[model samples]
Target chain A: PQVTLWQRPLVTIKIGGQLKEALLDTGADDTVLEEMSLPGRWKPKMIGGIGGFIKVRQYDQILIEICGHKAIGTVLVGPTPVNVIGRNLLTQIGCTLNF
Target chain B: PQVTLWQRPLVTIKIGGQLKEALLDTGADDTVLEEMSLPGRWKPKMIGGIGGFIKVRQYDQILIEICGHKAIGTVLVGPTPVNVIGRNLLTQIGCTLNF
Candidate 1:
């Protein structure tokens, strides 16, 4: 699928068997999601971005499906303003920047 | 031009007759830049992102050249941790999200 720059590039995805919408953030190095139910234990971590740093629950071995591409990797759960699909997941789907 | 998701989509842009590197932020609605010398008058505005809201100087009618693509539009300048190229300039260059 193709997403134009005119749009926010928001895509629907399935994570841990739940469907959700997330922004495809190429600037982000790690995938971040709003706080949700996850049945496993995770380590507490902090991530910094344009605004600074925020505390997050780092969960590993989560199944993520973007559009139709599938990947299993680490996902950070926290109080983010928006759900973000960062490079960690982008690489699995072979997403690229083109002009 | 093509950029891989493996790396942060940072691009060099020429703005206000100065060269700077900015992150291509698809999630951002407005282009935000690090504090720099910009000619002419500007209005005051605030933008909110992941962490919180920030104050910015809104400069309009500025010439911006990104990877040889030229665009004239509003550019917000302030003490942002990093420079960002939002959808505003991405449109002028015909950038798209591809997988």
Candidate 2:
């Protein structure tokens, strides 16, 4: 089944048991969140975007719920203006681009 | 119909009569290009993303073709490493995020 997406393509997600709004970004290779503290350990990594680069904590096997669909994947927690739900998590939800 | 998007949703887009590859970024609010020398007068502006902000020339009323769909909209040209086609142009081509 396919659901209509707005221009922004934002979706509700529950990560680390906290509800948050995340942008469904196909452009981003990995999921990025605004929070830095997670339950597990992560290696320090830097990711570049349209603006520049930012240091992030890359946590693996994190439980994330998107639209009630649960999936465990890698999540990068850092200082970003918005929470981006990238391809790593989107594929689990069978998300794609429609015209 | 929906197109299966890759981890990085790269698309062929024709802008200013030149064909170039662009990332279909739902997270981005506006379209951004790497070339600064585009046809048309533009106002100086800046946009922020995961990392930081960059100066750009915001050109208005530009023609862009995405997957053979023609659309006229605004385009921002700057010193970006990758070209990004944002929600502003995606809406013109009736593009949406699907599951």
Candidate 3:
């Protein structure tokens, strides 16, 4: 799928048996999702962005279905303005920047 | 050009006669750059992101050369972890997401 930049590159993702809309953020190093419960042990960590840094709970080896593509990677649960599917999972789902 | 997600998709951009590296941030609604001086009258504004919000100076109609492609749009000068070329300018440069 080729997504134009005319609008935000939003995609549907399935995680923990729930569906959510997330942005495909090439600038973000890791995926950050809104606070949610998952069945696994997580570690406390902080991630920095354009504004500042926020504390997050890092859950590793979590399986996420992105646009119907399954990927397993680390997902950070935090208080974010929006759900972001960053390079970590984007690479797994074979996303790229094209012109 | 097609950029793989194996590494950060950092591209060289020319603005205000200076060269800097910026990330193609599809998730960001507006382009945000590290604090820099640009000629023109700007208004103080605030932008929010994954972490939180920050104060920025919004400068409009600034000409920027992204990967040698020229684009003119609104740019926000603020404190950010990295220079982000958001969807605002990305669309002007004809950037897109492809899988």
Candidate 4:
């Protein structure tokens, strides 16, 4: 699949058996999602972005389906403006930037 | 060019005759650069992100050479962790996400 940059490169993601739209962010080092409840033990952590940093709950071994591609990795849950699928998962899905 | 997600998609950008490294960010809507002096009149603006919002100076029609490809658009100057080449400029370079 090829996604143009004319608009936000957002795609459907399936996590915890739920469907949501997430931005494919090449800039972000870690995937950060909006606050949501998940059944698992998590560690307290913080991640920095453009403006500043935010505390988050790190959930490991989380299974997510991005655009129907399955991947398992660490996901950060916090107060984010939007759901982001960063390079962490993008690598697993074999995503690349092309011109 | 094809860039894998194994590492940060960083590229050399030449702006105002100075070369610098920047991240190709699909998650960011506008291009934001670290604090620098540019000879032009700019407007005070603020942009929000994962953590919060920050004040920035918006300079329109600024020329930036990203990875040797030239692009001119609105660029924001602010205190950012890193210089980011967002979708606004990525589109001009015909960059896209492929998997």
Please, what is the whole-model Cα lDDT of each candidate in the order they appear?
A: 0.88, 0.84, 0.91, 0.93
Task: Please give the lDDT score for candidate 2.
Answer: 0.84
Which lDDT tens digits does candidate 1 get at residues A1-99? 878988789999998879999999887789999988988999999987656678999999999989988998999998789999998989999998888
Assess each model's interface with DockQ, reporting 2 decimals per model: 0.77, 0.69, 0.86, 0.92
Error of 4 at A39 (Å): 0.5
**Model 4 Cα lDDT, one tens digit per residue, A10-96:** 899989978899999999889999988788999999999877899999999999999889999999999999999999999999999
The per-prediction i-RMS, to one decimal, reads 1.2, 2.0, 1.0, 0.7
What does candidate 3 score on TM? 0.97
Predicted candidate 2 versus true structure: per-residue lDDT over B13-57, tens digit per residue: 888778999888877889899974576688999988768999999
Query: Number of the top candidate by lDDT?
Result: 4
- Ranked by DockQ, the better of candidates 2 and 4 is 4
In CAPRI terms, model 1 is classed as medium
Predicted chain B of candidate 4, TM-score versus the true chain B: 0.98
- Ordering by DockQ: 4, 3, 1, 2
Q: Which stretches of candidate 1 lie over 4 Å from their true place?
A: none
Q: Which tens-of-lDDT digit does each residue in A7-91 have in candidate 3?
A: 8788999999999999898988899999887897999999887667899999999999999999999999989979999899999
Model 1 Cα displacement at A85 (Å)? 0.4
Tell me the deviation in Å of residue A63 in model 1: 0.9
Candidate 1 chain B, which ten residues in sequence have the lowest lDDT sum? B46-55
Give the C-alpha miss distance for residue A6 in model 2, angstroms: 4.6
**Which segments of candidate 3 are over 4 A away from where they belong?**
none
Decide which is better by DockQ, 1 or 4: 4
Candidate 4 off by > 4 Å: none
